[PDB]
Each structure stands twice: as C-alpha cells, then as structure tokens.
RNA sequence: GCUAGUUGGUGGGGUAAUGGCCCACCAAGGCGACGACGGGUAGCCGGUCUGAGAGGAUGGCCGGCCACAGGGGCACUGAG
RNA sequence: GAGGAAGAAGCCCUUCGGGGUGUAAACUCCUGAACCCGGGACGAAACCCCCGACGAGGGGACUGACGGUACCGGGGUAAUAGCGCCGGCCAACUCCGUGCCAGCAGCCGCGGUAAUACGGAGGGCGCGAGCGUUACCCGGAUUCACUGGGCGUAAAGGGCGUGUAGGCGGCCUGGGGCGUCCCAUGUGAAAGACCACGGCUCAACCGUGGGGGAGCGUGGGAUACGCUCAGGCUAGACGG
RNA sequence: CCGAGGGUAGGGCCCGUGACUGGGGCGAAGUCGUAACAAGGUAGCUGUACCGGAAGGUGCGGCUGGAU
C-alpha cells in the first residue's frame, strides 16, 4: 500500500528536511539537525560526483516522498498533467496539491500527511457534508472540507485546531477554526508552495 | 537542361556564395514571377531584363550584410538557404492546410497556385494551395 | 453513376468485341511520384463500328458474358495507331525475357 | 537511389532470425535428459560446466546449461528449459529451470532465490 | 562570473622508448544562465591544470544566444565533421530534451525548453562544437528584418 | 419485421438502454438501423429518459412494432399523445 | 511463360435474375516483367500496440462481413 | 498515527577512540481493517383489469436470481511483506570464505591466495501485493534513410559501346481543364481515440453531448505549374 | 449422362535418410616448412595456364595499392 518504515532516513538520504513527522520536525531532536548525512555504513564518506540520472532521480524521489504517494499513482498523475493544457510542472503540482489527505493536512486537521491519511481513511472527514474515506479523492475549487459532526469532540482534532488558531493557511485555502471547516478556493500557485523541488528535473526524468 | 527553376536557384546560390554583385540567368516568365517574389521579400535588391548575344536574360542584383570584424571579415548572407522542393522527378503539391511554415516565420515558401505565384503567407491569406516551388531563408 | 472510362482499341479479333486499353495516373502512396498504369477491358461492340486505333469511351453495363461487363458508349477520335504501336512493341518485347 | 528506382524496386525490409528455434514459439519447453556431463569453456575461461542433453516435446534435441552450485539431474530426468545462451560454451542455447519437474532448487541458497528456485528459509 | 560545468575528461597517450606517457584533455562549458555560453578544450599533463586551462579558454570564446521565453527563435540543423545536431523550440513546459553534452551547453546558456537530436557521429567533442555553431547561427525576427528591409 | 426496442449498454449492475430501431433478427446488442432515444432505469440523472418524438412517429408510421417496455417509454415521452 | 469451356459469337437449358453458369455448333482467341502461371503463408475490417511524425507490427475480447458443423458429395421442404 | 535516547540489547565494521542498523525498537497516548448486533435497497412498470370506445387519456394490483448482497446506524482488536539489484552502462559498499575451482554473465568481461563482478553476512538502492525471468512486437536503429543514408581509398560505378520498353525534358501565344487547388453536398455505422459535462464515496468503469477524420461519389469554380491539342522562335540537337 | 470415392499406369516437385566421399568453421599444446607484413631477404598483387608434400613456383600479359 504505502511506505510504513523509518522516515528520518529518507530526509537524511535526500539531504533536506521533509517534514514527515509533525511536531518532532521543528524540535531540536530532528534527525536532520544531528546527523545530516545519509544512513548506513558509508554515510560519512566523501560523496562522489552525481550523474545526471542520479540528480533527476533524487529530485523526483524527494518530490514523491514529500507526499507519500506510490510510484504508480505518481506516474499516472504526471501523465495526466502532461495531457492537460497548461504548463505541465504547474499543473502537476496543482494536481498533487488537490489530494484530500494533503488538503486536510494543510487545513490543519492533522500535523502530518500520514496522520491526514489515517484521518481521511478512518471516516473522520466529510467533503460537502457527505463522508469521504479515500485519500486520493481530488478536491475541486469550491469544495468544503470539514470534520464529521460526530468527530468534532475528538481530543486529537481538538488539539490540532487549538494549535492552528494562530497559524494562517495559504491564500488558496480558507479555514474556520470555530466552524471546524475548510474551503478550497483555487488551484495553488507554484509560488505558494515552499517546495525544495525543481519540477523541470522531474519532467526531464520522465522524458527518459 | 532539365530544370530551369532549379538551375536559376543554383545560379543565385553559387553567385551569392562568392559575394558577386549580379548574376545573369536565361529569361522566362515563370522565372520572372519567382524573382519578383524574391525582390518583394527583400532577399534580392532587384532584377532587370537585358540582352546577351541578342538573347533575353534576367540580371539579378544580390544583397549582403555589413563587413564583419575578425579573422573572417566576409559579410553575412541575406539568402542563407534556398532549396527547390518540387522536381521533375517528383512533383510536390500541398493543400491550403498542408502549407509549410518555414523557419518559424523567418523563411518563406513559394507556391504556384491557380491565383498565381504566391508566398505561403499570401496563399494562406487567400485560402489556396498548389505546387511547392522552393523554400528560402 | 455508371463508370465511364476512355481508352484506345488495341484488339478487334473477336466478333462484336473490342479490347480497350485504359490508362490511369496516381501518386505513389509512399514515394509521392505520379505513376501510370494501364488495364485492358473487353467491351461489347454489336455493330462492329470501331476498329484498331479508335479512341472510344466505354461504360459499365450488365454482364454480356464472362470478362465482358462494359459497353462502347461513343467514339472520341480516330487514327491513333501510335498508342497501338506502343502496346504491340511492349507485348513483343516479352519474347526475349524468357530463360 | 532515384525516386523512379525506388518506385521500380522499393526498399527491402529486414527479417530477424530466432535464436531459440527449439522452443517453437513457446516461452518454455519440457524435455527428458539423455546425457548429463561437464564441458570445458573456450578461451580465456577455464571451468567444468554442467550441461544436459535434452530431448524436447517439440521434436528437437538440444544442449541446456544447468545453473547454480550442485544439481540432482541424471539420465531420464524431466526438466523445463528456457531461452538464453551461455556465451563461453559452444552450441549451448538454453537454460534448465531450477525447481521445476525433476530439477531441484539450489540448496542453501540465500540470495536471488526466485532464480535457482529456492523457497524462503 | 559564470557557472562552470565539466563536460568531458579523458586520458590520451603517446609512445616513446620506455613506454607510454599520458596527457589529460578537459572539455568545459562556462555560462551564466542568462544568454552567455562558451566552450573550452584544455590539454595538460595533470587533470586540475587541464580543467583550469579549459575554463580559461572557455571564458575567451562566448556566444550571445538570442533567448526568448527560455527557448530558441527557430529550428536549426548544423553539421560538424560527420556529427549532426538538430535543435527545435518548444513550449514553456517541455524542459530540456537532450543528450548530456547538448543539455549542458544549452542549460548553461539559459535555455529551459528545447527538443534536440544527435545524428551521425556521436563523438562528444564534435557534438559540442556543432552545438556551439548552431547557437552561433541563431537569428531573431528583428535581425532578419534589419537584414532584408 | 422492423422493431423499436432497447439495446443494453453500460456495465455490470449499471444498465443503460438505447431506444433503437432495428430488424428483429439482429442480436440485441448488435448493429441497429438508427438510434432515437435513451433510458436509465435507475434514474441517477435529471434526464434519465429521452425520445426523438418525430423520428419515432416516422418509424411507427412505416410499420415498426415497439416492444412493451419501448411502447411504455414512448408513451411516457408523449409519442402517442394526440 | 499460362490457358482448350480456354477467349468470343449464335441458339438453347437452368435461375428470382445477368453471365460459359451448363450444353450443341462457328471462329481462334484470352492472360502475362504494370509480374501471368506456380510454390509458401493467411480468415478480412472498425480497430490495437509502438512511434515525434512518417512508418512498423498486429487482428485475443467487443461491433461488422465471410467460411465451416466428424472427413467428402447431393438434393428436398421452404419467403429464405 | 503521534510522541519517544547524543542513541538500550543483538548483529556488522573499526584507525579500538568509535561508527552503523536508528525514532528504528522498547515505552506512553490516539484511531479502529477484520469481527458483532440491528435496519435495508435501486434496478419494476409494463403487459393485466376498470372507466373512456379493448383508441387517446386517467385509476388499481402482481412481479427480485443477484440478496439479507451493496449500503446505513450502533459496538469493536494494533491488525500480511515481499521481490530484484548494488564493476561500467545504472541508483546503491564493506567484511569474510574460496583460489581459472566453485561459480557469474545482456555486452565489455569477472575468478589462477588481499575479488566493490563468485557464495554468505552487515549495510544500501528501486519497486511493493507484488517483484523478477523466458518468449514475441515496436522503439532506440537516420542500421532499407518518403520524412531521413550512401558508392576515389571504409561495403558499394556495370569491361566498353549501340540501343528497345520505360523515366525525364528549351523560349512565346491561344483552346481544353486530365493531374493540381478551392467551395457546397452525400458517405466515412456503433464501440474505441480527443474535448466538455455527468453517475458509481474516488478511480478503474460507465452515460450524455460536441468535434474531428484519410479516402470515395456528386455539383460548381480557378488555370500558375504538370498533361494534352494547335500556331510560332532558335540559345539545345542535327545538317551544308 | 454427370458424379464422391476406390483402382491401375506413367510423370513433376519437395522432405527425411544412406556405405562412402568433398570441403568449411572452430582449438590457451602437436608435425613440416616460412608464403605475406621492412627492398620481408626473388617487390607485391592480379587474370589465365602448367607444375609441386604444403604454404607456393614458373610462363604470358596487366596494375602500383612498389622502387629507381
Ligand atoms: S524530524 Fe527531521 S529528519 Fe525526521 S522526518 Fe521530521 S524533518 Fe525529517
Ligand atoms: Mg515525376
Ligand atoms: Mg490500370
Ligand atoms: Mg482502371
Ligand atoms: Mg453476346
Ligand atoms: Mg528454363
Ligand atoms: Mg539523380
Ligand atoms: Mg577468465
Ligand atoms: Mg535478490
Ligand atoms: Mg565527427
Ligand atoms: Mg556527411
Ligand atoms: Mg554511427
Ligand atoms: Mg461446350
Ligand atoms: Mg468455364
Ligand atoms: Mg469463356
Ligand atoms: Mg482504421
Ligand atoms: Mg501518439
Ligand atoms: Mg500516427
Ligand atoms: Mg479474425
Ligand atoms: Mg472467409
Ligand atoms: Mg469441414
Ligand atoms: Mg471434432
Ligand atoms: Mg416459411
Ligand atoms: Mg422450393
Ligand atoms: Mg512512530
Ligand atoms: Mg425494484
Ligand atoms: Mg446484517
Ligand atoms: Mg461503525
Ligand atoms: Mg553509480
Ligand atoms: Mg562475475
Ligand atoms: Mg547473481
Ligand atoms: Mg578474498
Ligand atoms: Mg552484477
Ligand atoms: Mg558478495
Ligand atoms: Mg518512446
Ligand atoms: Mg543507438
Ligand atoms: Mg527505422
Ligand atoms: Mg533515429
Ligand atoms: Mg533518401
Ligand atoms: Mg552509411
Ligand atoms: Mg569509396
Ligand atoms: Mg569518398
Ligand atoms: Mg581494400
Ligand atoms: Mg557497408
Ligand atoms: Mg572497396
Ligand atoms: Mg568504368
Ligand atoms: Mg568494379
Ligand atoms: Mg573494356
Ligand atoms: Mg536496345
Ligand atoms: Mg542511347
Ligand atoms: Mg546494354
Ligand atoms: Mg524513347
Ligand atoms: Mg481537373
Ligand atoms: Mg464514428
Ligand atoms: Mg464526479
Ligand atoms: Mg459519444
Ligand atoms: Mg465532382
Ligand atoms: Mg511543359
Ligand atoms: Mg510546338
Ligand atoms: Mg538430402
Ligand atoms: Mg613471394
Ligand atoms: Mg619475413
Ligand atoms: Mg617470407
Ligand atoms: Mg626472417
Ligand atoms: Mg625468403
Ligand atoms: Mg618476397
Ligand atoms: Mg620468399
Ligand atoms: Mg616488401
Ligand atoms: Mg611491393
Ligand atoms: Mg601468375
Ligand atoms: Mg592446356
Ligand atoms: Mg616450376
């Protein structure tokens, strides 16, 4: 299904922080703040020159591991974005950002995309009233994302919305902490996402 | 001789590649139409009708760029490339929707259509097609 | 509509029948060059008006026999023995192609 | 060639040749071993490579390589063969599949077990 | 100053009484990703000296590369001693579709979207020279109209 | 004889019928002479029944015999209305 | 190189109907290097896979047409 | 799922100081696939009967294999992971064992006592209910080159003439309009491909609508070019 | 009368196989010589003819992809 093993080793391999854990990522004990070298026996040896294929593969793997999506789904989404009219990198980023689990992670109902996946799957999230239990559901502009009425009195949800009363969501989103409900206004822009990714490298990787 | 049009284009290419001022070609009306198209598009300065040994000839006046600085000071060309498309051994016809775009719009294609000898842009504006004579850029 | 072809009479040795050589042109499907092909048709000629060298028009018709599904519609021109000569020379050249 | 020459004669397509004709269009073939022996490779390699003479269901009789360390094949063993030549052995074009019919899997194999037909320990 | 990309390293040999003696050749491309690109081929008894000399030669031979929206103004086909390069503009999302040598040359020049193909001989040095020539022959519409009218 | 009937399309547990005019000996999902309407028995859509009234009138006028379900659907769409 | 019902004509038989489809007689024609004849292989198409395109390969399922119903031949009934 | 050690034990490596597996585990908190209880489908309104006139148009009833299934509500446990690869191409490296043996191999090639290439182990990379292998097709192969190749020495000019079919052909004027081009119209079924909308909680899948589309028939138009007919010219060719 | 099929006789083409016999490709070693690459120790190559264990030799003519 998905990757369910150790997750800081992914950050150490990619050489950058992929915020895949939530609170611990901003703590001093983040593994990228203590051992910023790749895992294994040879992580502290001098790095050799990366080939072009290595560079493009690492960039694509970074982008894929940020969202925790399998390679089959990732490639299907990429081909779909390439079919659409519009700059394929921006369209691909928008399609990735429209997944329900990512949307409820950004709205603040969860602290990590993994937790957002568990929230959506376990029937705690409703889109436009009806309950949706599929992380891959694609949110269209105007859709209302919210916590189920019987799930509002949940400790995890209560704490998550408490910790977000100060934090402000992106321009492409709206949140009502009192109303416990979100709103997807438009496709996110490429500048609105603080992604350590060059999408041209991903496109060139998939041209091979 | 088998291809007067290709022969004239070859005369122009050969004379241009040595930076001559003018070149002569045996006269004909179709050749005159092609030369008029070339002059209107700025690839040549012009052309005129003269007599050599009592025979009618067309004198074409070639045009070049400014002098260049360096190891090679020969001026750059205004006719970089000229090529015949339809040949006696293979005739090429295109409809109005098969009209090629040469050099993304910097080059031209010459067409023989029922409305006359036109540039590709001219033929597209008139919505007509025909034989493809040559491409120039 | 009934197909009308135009050709030249190259054989009139049968009774009430003329062989008509019809030529057609078409561009080559892949190489683009225009090429010529020819085909012979046996055509019904009940009154035996048309002879060697005649350029005539024939029209698709009800079967008159085997191999005979066209009828001579009208005469186009006469005195075209040169086309017949081309066909006969081409046929004669085959005798030297054997082994 | 000229356009007219191409019209007269055209361009000739390329016909490929099968390297595994004894398979007769199948991915695998069953056979019976008649001779099991060892052969020596060509220069520069030096070894004693284990091969079997196999009479197949398709009517041919071929030589097949036995991969892996140690085998239990002998005369009248039933085997499955697949395509793939052994470079340094003359005339050997097929591989015995380990773990099928009378060809046991490689004992004590720990890596790449889907090849060599060894169950998970 | 410019970004530096090392395209090729190789060791060549000559013979004398005693045996073979080696030399190193470095092909290096220098550019600022804004319209300037240059190529240099340096030979030296040692690799770092070869790279330094290649960069020094590259900085002394640059082309202006008339970019427009990250692509080239028109398609171009250029031959250099049995090597052939074909370049074609593309839409803003295409990316750079090229082999390693043309990709390095075009990326350091500021090209973000292009379609390329290598034909004939695929020798890296001659392919790089052909790419440089093709970039040298690029003309915009203003250039051609300043030339014709 | 010519009949006006229902040809099944869609997928398993999701039937979608086309009201078509065809020869009676053709198999029910085979080629038809022409298509005049469509029907969705589950009514999952605001417009789950459409009929070309003029064409159905023409085909009825020349001797096409509808089936019971087809006749019912044509009556609902108002083909026999006077 | 092939062809002797072979190619054409006249009359007839047969068919829902044209026709050497079949028969009798008369003429000597018909086809072929634009590849006849012979040998090998093959159900054909809408489509499918691949490919930048041009092209190449392919015709499982689904829709259309054809052929066959143990291997051959034949007719009856019938609108078929 | 969240938190969770300058970081336990085991295992591997070490320059003997330590390094890695690794927040990974353990451990605490949270959620609740499987399971349990209850409810419960759509797909089925016609033919049929009554009135009206066995018409049009109104009224009523019967009919479920799938199936107690999908689904809904209320309870509820921390709950399968494997396969290939790690010399270059090609992403991912160390130790031990062996010693041209055993073995690996798609190509180049590895192995003959210090093997990143064989076997095992620790570690790593790629995918993941899959991962590999064999067979076949297209691609890469511009390596049958129409788009888009060549023939002095790399494979490739016939030993040389003459010439049949065929292919190609100078300048000017008019007619035809066969090729060629344009316009309208018929056909190019459905499904599939594309675009938009829509139904299954998404998706696959499906529905609706729209647009394309080579070729072919028909009617009309154009005549620059090719063809064809006719009349001229002398720069090609031939003759004196 | 035609007629599936069966029978008889003579041909054409193709496939498998055969005592024996001819060459070909290959080989981390054998026997005989040393023809070619240097003017390769007789410049080489070449068509043809004859000859010799073998590479090859010689005659006649040709080429330089040899020299002077
Ligand atoms: S704590 Fe740091 S290293 Fe670990 S998953 Fe979060 S961002 Fe990555
Ligand atoms: Mg031609
Ligand atoms: Mg013909
Ligand atoms: Mg014809
Ligand atoms: Mg008759
Ligand atoms: Mg013979
Ligand atoms: Mg030529
Ligand atoms: Mg070896
Ligand atoms: Mg493995
Ligand atoms: Mg070169
Ligand atoms: Mg070249
Ligand atoms: Mg090459
Ligand atoms: Mg008879
Ligand atoms: Mg007959
Ligand atoms: Mg006959
Ligand atoms: Mg088709
Ligand atoms: Mg495509
Ligand atoms: Mg295509
Ligand atoms: Mg079929
Ligand atoms: Mg059939
Ligand atoms: Mg049968
Ligand atoms: Mg049977
Ligand atoms: Mg009946
Ligand atoms: Mg009857
Ligand atoms: Mg955890
Ligand atoms: Mg129901
Ligand atoms: Mg129940
Ligand atoms: Mg529940
Ligand atoms: Mg590597
Ligand atoms: Mg090995
Ligand atoms: Mg292995
Ligand atoms: Mg060792
Ligand atoms: Mg390996
Ligand atoms: Mg190992
Ligand atoms: Mg591809
Ligand atoms: Mg290649
Ligand atoms: Mg190809
Ligand atoms: Mg290619
Ligand atoms: Mg070509
Ligand atoms: Mg070549
Ligand atoms: Mg040569
Ligand atoms: Mg040459
Ligand atoms: Mg040679
Ligand atoms: Mg060659
Ligand atoms: Mg040669
Ligand atoms: Mg010669
Ligand atoms: Mg020769
Ligand atoms: Mg001679
Ligand atoms: Mg001759
Ligand atoms: Mg001649
Ligand atoms: Mg001759
Ligand atoms: Mg001639
Ligand atoms: Mg016309
Ligand atoms: Mg259609
Ligand atoms: Mg929807
Ligand atoms: Mg549709
Ligand atoms: Mg018409
Ligand atoms: Mg002409
Ligand atoms: Mg004349
Ligand atoms: Mg034999
Ligand atoms: Mg000698
Ligand atoms: Mg010697
Ligand atoms: Mg010697
Ligand atoms: Mg010596
Ligand atoms: Mg000697
Ligand atoms: Mg000698
Ligand atoms: Mg000697
Ligand atoms: Mg010598
Ligand atoms: Mg010599
Ligand atoms: Mg001799
Ligand atoms: Mg003699
Ligand atoms: Mg002698």
mmCIF file of C-alpha atoms in Angstrom, chain A:
data_model
loop_
_atom_site.group_PDB
_atom_site.id
_atom_site.type_symbol
_atom_site.label_atom_id
_atom_site.label_comp_id
_atom_site.label_asym_id
_atom_site.label_seq_id
_atom_site.Cartn_x
_atom_site.Cartn_y
_atom_site.Cartn_z
ATOM 1 C CA UNK A 1 0.000 0.000 0.000
ATOM 2 C CA UNK A 2 2.279 2.749 1.309
ATOM 3 C CA UNK A 3 5.675 3.072 2.991
ATOM 4 C CA UNK A 4 5.425 2.243 6.700
ATOM 5 C CA UNK A 5 9.064 2.073 7.771
ATOM 6 C CA UNK A 6 11.535 4.537 9.290
ATOM 7 C CA UNK A 7 11.071 8.034 7.927
ATOM 8 C CA UNK A 8 14.010 10.222 9.052
ATOM 9 C CA UNK A 9 16.384 8.123 6.935
ATOM 10 C CA UNK A 10 14.504 9.478 3.910
ATOM 11 C CA UNK A 11 15.365 13.038 4.947
ATOM 12 C CA UNK A 12 18.978 12.061 5.624
ATOM 13 C CA UNK A 13 19.266 10.446 2.186
ATOM 14 C CA UNK A 14 17.635 13.368 0.365
ATOM 15 C CA UNK A 15 19.896 15.771 2.272
ATOM 16 C CA UNK A 16 16.985 18.065 3.217
ATOM 17 C CA UNK A 17 14.168 18.219 5.759
ATOM 18 C CA UNK A 18 10.981 16.548 4.552
ATOM 19 C CA UNK A 19 8.504 17.394 7.309
ATOM 20 C CA UNK A 20 7.143 13.854 7.522
ATOM 21 C CA UNK A 21 6.726 13.611 11.319
ATOM 22 C CA UNK A 22 4.973 16.768 12.544
ATOM 23 C CA UNK A 23 5.999 18.217 15.899
ATOM 24 C CA UNK A 24 9.376 16.455 16.121
ATOM 25 C CA UNK A 25 10.416 18.059 12.819
ATOM 26 C CA UNK A 26 10.560 21.517 14.434
ATOM 27 C CA UNK A 27 12.141 20.201 17.647
ATOM 28 C CA UNK A 28 15.917 20.228 18.227
ATOM 29 C CA UNK A 29 15.937 16.410 18.034
ATOM 30 C CA UNK A 30 15.136 16.395 14.313
ATOM 31 C CA UNK A 31 17.478 13.857 12.733
ATOM 32 C CA UNK A 32 18.477 16.422 10.092
ATOM 33 C CA UNK A 33 19.789 18.651 12.909
ATOM 34 C CA UNK A 34 22.013 15.927 14.406
ATOM 35 C CA UNK A 35 23.145 13.545 11.625
ATOM 36 C CA UNK A 36 22.717 15.363 8.300
ATOM 37 C CA UNK A 37 24.470 12.603 6.335
ATOM 38 C CA UNK A 38 22.874 9.608 4.553
ATOM 39 C CA UNK A 39 22.169 6.430 6.542
ATOM 40 C CA UNK A 40 24.235 3.275 6.594
ATOM 41 C CA UNK A 41 27.866 2.289 6.822
ATOM 42 C CA UNK A 42 29.126 4.729 4.167
ATOM 43 C CA UNK A 43 27.114 7.840 5.046
ATOM 44 C CA UNK A 44 30.116 9.797 6.344
ATOM 45 C CA UNK A 45 32.466 9.121 3.418
ATOM 46 C CA UNK A 46 33.143 11.823 0.850
ATOM 47 C CA UNK A 47 30.408 11.960 -1.773
ATOM 48 C CA UNK A 48 31.248 11.219 -5.391
ATOM 49 C CA UNK A 49 30.060 13.358 -8.287
ATOM 50 C CA UNK A 50 26.383 12.571 -9.000
ATOM 51 C CA UNK A 51 25.458 11.702 -12.560
ATOM 52 C CA UNK A 52 22.620 13.431 -14.404
ATOM 53 C CA UNK A 53 20.365 10.405 -13.917
ATOM 54 C CA UNK A 54 21.187 10.389 -10.199
ATOM 55 C CA UNK A 55 20.321 14.086 -9.858
ATOM 56 C CA UNK A 56 16.969 13.737 -11.610
ATOM 57 C CA UNK A 57 16.119 10.528 -9.740
ATOM 58 C CA UNK A 58 16.891 12.113 -6.368
ATOM 59 C CA UNK A 59 14.796 15.191 -7.152
ATOM 60 C CA UNK A 60 11.848 13.038 -8.252
ATOM 61 C CA UNK A 61 12.153 10.809 -5.182
ATOM 62 C CA UNK A 62 12.210 13.875 -2.935
ATOM 63 C CA UNK A 63 9.024 15.187 -4.538
ATOM 64 C CA UNK A 64 7.337 11.781 -4.296
ATOM 65 C CA UNK A 65 8.340 11.169 -0.671
ATOM 66 C CA UNK A 66 7.079 14.594 0.410
ATOM 67 C CA UNK A 67 3.520 13.495 -0.424
ATOM 68 C CA UNK A 68 3.897 9.805 0.478
ATOM 69 C CA UNK A 69 2.447 8.536 -2.807
ATOM 70 C CA UNK A 70 3.331 5.312 -4.611
ATOM 71 C CA UNK A 71 5.243 5.496 -7.879
ATOM 72 C CA UNK A 72 2.353 4.083 -9.932
ATOM 73 C CA UNK A 73 -0.018 6.813 -8.725
ATOM 74 C CA UNK A 74 2.727 9.435 -9.087
ATOM 75 C CA UNK A 75 3.403 8.490 -12.708
ATOM 76 C CA UNK A 76 -0.299 8.302 -13.572
ATOM 77 C CA UNK A 77 -0.752 11.801 -12.141
ATOM 78 C CA UNK A 78 2.260 13.031 -14.113
ATOM 79 C CA UNK A 79 0.967 11.639 -17.412
ATOM 80 C CA UNK A 80 -2.451 13.142 -16.689
ATOM 81 C CA UNK A 81 -0.840 16.531 -16.022
ATOM 82 C CA UNK A 82 1.164 16.245 -19.245
ATOM 83 C CA UNK A 83 -2.065 15.602 -21.161
ATOM 84 C CA UNK A 84 -3.750 18.717 -19.755
ATOM 85 C CA UNK A 85 -3.352 22.133 -21.335
ATOM 86 C CA UNK A 86 -1.176 24.344 -19.152
ATOM 87 C CA UNK A 87 2.472 24.318 -18.080
ATOM 88 C CA UNK A 88 2.929 20.692 -17.096
ATOM 89 C CA UNK A 89 5.020 21.410 -13.995
ATOM 90 C CA UNK A 90 2.457 23.801 -12.526
ATOM 91 C CA UNK A 91 -0.448 21.520 -13.471
ATOM 92 C CA UNK A 92 1.335 18.560 -11.870
ATOM 93 C CA UNK A 93 1.986 20.498 -8.660
ATOM 94 C CA UNK A 94 -1.659 21.579 -8.543
ATOM 95 C CA UNK A 95 -2.890 18.023 -9.095
ATOM 96 C CA UNK A 96 -0.618 16.792 -6.304
ATOM 97 C CA UNK A 97 -1.845 19.569 -4.005
ATOM 98 C CA UNK A 98 -5.518 18.716 -4.635
ATOM 99 C CA UNK A 99 -5.413 15.315 -2.917
ATOM 100 C CA UNK A 100 -7.788 15.112 0.035
ATOM 101 C CA UNK A 101 -5.181 13.953 2.563
ATOM 102 C CA UNK A 102 -2.831 16.793 1.613
ATOM 103 C CA UNK A 103 -5.716 19.287 1.713
ATOM 104 C CA UNK A 104 -6.714 18.297 5.245
ATOM 105 C CA UNK A 105 -3.041 18.323 6.256
ATOM 106 C CA UNK A 106 -2.770 21.914 5.015
ATOM 107 C CA UNK A 107 -6.061 22.917 6.662
ATOM 108 C CA UNK A 108 -4.545 21.880 9.998
ATOM 109 C CA UNK A 109 -6.782 18.976 10.997
ATOM 110 C CA UNK A 110 -3.567 16.904 11.117
ATOM 111 C CA UNK A 111 0.103 17.540 11.875
ATOM 112 C CA UNK A 112 1.490 15.210 9.186
ATOM 113 C CA UNK A 113 0.388 13.808 5.844
ATOM 114 C CA UNK A 114 0.491 10.307 7.335
ATOM 115 C CA UNK A 115 -1.869 11.424 10.107
ATOM 116 C CA UNK A 116 -4.066 13.105 7.494
ATOM 117 C CA UNK A 117 -4.213 9.822 5.578
ATOM 118 C CA UNK A 118 -5.291 7.990 8.726
ATOM 119 C CA UNK A 119 -7.895 10.684 9.447
ATOM 120 C CA UNK A 120 -9.415 10.516 5.961
ATOM 121 C CA UNK A 121 -9.315 6.716 5.792
ATOM 122 C CA UNK A 122 -10.935 6.172 9.202
ATOM 123 C CA UNK A 123 -14.045 8.168 8.282
ATOM 124 C CA UNK A 124 -13.383 11.391 10.209
ATOM 125 C CA UNK A 125 -13.547 13.843 7.269
ATOM 126 C CA UNK A 126 -16.544 15.000 5.226
ATOM 127 C CA UNK A 127 -16.483 16.775 1.863
ATOM 128 C CA UNK A 128 -19.607 18.895 1.293
ATOM 129 C CA UNK A 129 -21.477 17.045 4.042
ATOM 130 C CA UNK A 130 -21.114 13.508 2.720
ATOM 131 C CA UNK A 131 -18.342 11.437 4.280
ATOM 132 C CA UNK A 132 -15.295 10.580 2.158
ATOM 133 C CA UNK A 133 -12.835 7.872 3.216
ATOM 134 C CA UNK A 134 -10.434 7.982 0.243
ATOM 135 C CA UNK A 135 -7.094 9.852 0.447
ATOM 136 C CA UNK A 136 -6.789 10.007 -3.355
ATOM 137 C CA UNK A 137 -10.055 11.939 -3.790
ATOM 138 C CA UNK A 138 -9.320 15.082 -5.800
ATOM 139 C CA UNK A 139 -10.733 18.312 -4.376
ATOM 140 C CA UNK A 140 -12.156 20.814 -6.857
ATOM 141 C CA UNK A 141 -12.345 24.577 -6.213
ATOM 142 C CA UNK A 142 -15.361 25.391 -4.066
ATOM 143 C CA UNK A 143 -15.466 22.076 -2.205
ATOM 144 C CA UNK A 144 -15.981 22.366 1.554
ATOM 145 C CA UNK A 145 -13.765 20.104 3.676
ATOM 146 C CA UNK A 146 -14.718 19.627 7.314
ATOM 147 C CA UNK A 147 -14.577 17.300 10.297
ATOM 148 C CA UNK A 148 -17.526 14.952 10.753
ATOM 149 C CA UNK A 149 -20.155 16.340 13.115
ATOM 150 C CA UNK A 150 -19.753 13.354 15.450
ATOM 151 C CA UNK A 151 -15.947 13.710 15.289
ATOM 152 C CA UNK A 152 -15.765 17.328 16.489
ATOM 153 C CA UNK A 153 -15.375 16.247 20.131
ATOM 154 C CA UNK A 154 -12.154 14.325 19.448
ATOM 155 C CA UNK A 155 -9.043 15.057 21.502
ATOM 156 C CA UNK A 156 -6.600 14.845 18.582
ATOM 157 C CA UNK A 157 -8.790 17.085 16.416
ATOM 158 C CA UNK A 158 -9.361 19.483 19.320
ATOM 159 C CA UNK A 159 -5.624 19.864 19.931
ATOM 160 C CA UNK A 160 -4.863 20.213 16.216
ATOM 161 C CA UNK A 161 -7.394 23.018 15.772
ATOM 162 C CA UNK A 162 -6.166 24.597 19.021
ATOM 163 C CA UNK A 163 -2.590 24.737 17.723
ATOM 164 C CA UNK A 164 -3.795 26.305 14.444
ATOM 165 C CA UNK A 165 -5.805 29.192 15.932
ATOM 166 C CA UNK A 166 -2.664 31.281 15.406
ATOM 167 C CA UNK A 167 -1.262 29.747 12.224
ATOM 168 C CA UNK A 168 -2.636 31.145 8.957
ATOM 169 C CA UNK A 169 -3.411 28.873 5.995
ATOM 170 C CA UNK A 170 -2.267 29.579 2.451
ATOM 171 C CA UNK A 171 -4.020 32.042 0.141
ATOM 172 C CA UNK A 172 -5.575 29.172 -1.851
ATOM 173 C CA UNK A 173 -7.374 27.936 1.291
ATOM 174 C CA UNK A 174 -9.736 29.228 3.959
ATOM 175 C CA UNK A 175 -10.280 27.861 7.466
ATOM 176 C CA UNK A 176 -12.876 28.340 10.206
ATOM 177 C CA UNK A 177 -11.450 27.070 13.492
ATOM 178 C CA UNK A 178 -14.686 27.864 15.328
ATOM 179 C CA UNK A 179 -16.690 26.316 12.493
ATOM 180 C CA UNK A 180 -14.135 23.489 12.275
ATOM 181 C CA UNK A 181 -14.369 23.608 8.486
ATOM 182 C CA UNK A 182 -12.204 24.425 5.488
ATOM 183 C CA UNK A 183 -12.710 25.701 1.967
ATOM 184 C CA UNK A 184 -10.666 25.052 -1.185
ATOM 185 C CA UNK A 185 -10.707 28.306 -3.138
ATOM 186 C CA UNK A 186 -8.484 27.631 -6.155
ATOM 187 C CA UNK A 187 -5.591 25.620 -7.524
ATOM 188 C CA UNK A 188 -2.443 26.539 -5.553
ATOM 189 C CA UNK A 189 0.137 28.602 -7.397
ATOM 190 C CA UNK A 190 3.697 27.391 -7.872
ATOM 191 C CA UNK A 191 4.983 30.301 -5.763
ATOM 192 C CA UNK A 192 2.608 29.489 -2.884
ATOM 193 C CA UNK A 193 4.298 26.119 -2.227
ATOM 194 C CA UNK A 194 7.615 26.175 -0.342
ATOM 195 C CA UNK A 195 8.804 23.019 -2.060
ATOM 196 C CA UNK A 196 12.551 22.241 -2.279
ATOM 197 C CA UNK A 197 11.928 20.806 -5.750
ATOM 198 C CA UNK A 198 12.863 21.770 -9.300
ATOM 199 C CA UNK A 199 9.953 20.332 -11.274
ATOM 200 C CA UNK A 200 11.857 20.717 -14.551
ATOM 201 C CA UNK A 201 14.133 17.954 -13.264
ATOM 202 C CA UNK A 202 11.094 15.725 -12.669
ATOM 203 C CA UNK A 203 9.754 16.409 -16.174
ATOM 204 C CA UNK A 204 13.153 15.645 -17.706
ATOM 205 C CA UNK A 205 13.344 12.484 -15.589
ATOM 206 C CA UNK A 206 10.044 11.299 -17.031
ATOM 207 C CA UNK A 207 11.170 12.157 -20.573
ATOM 208 C CA UNK A 208 13.738 9.328 -20.405
#
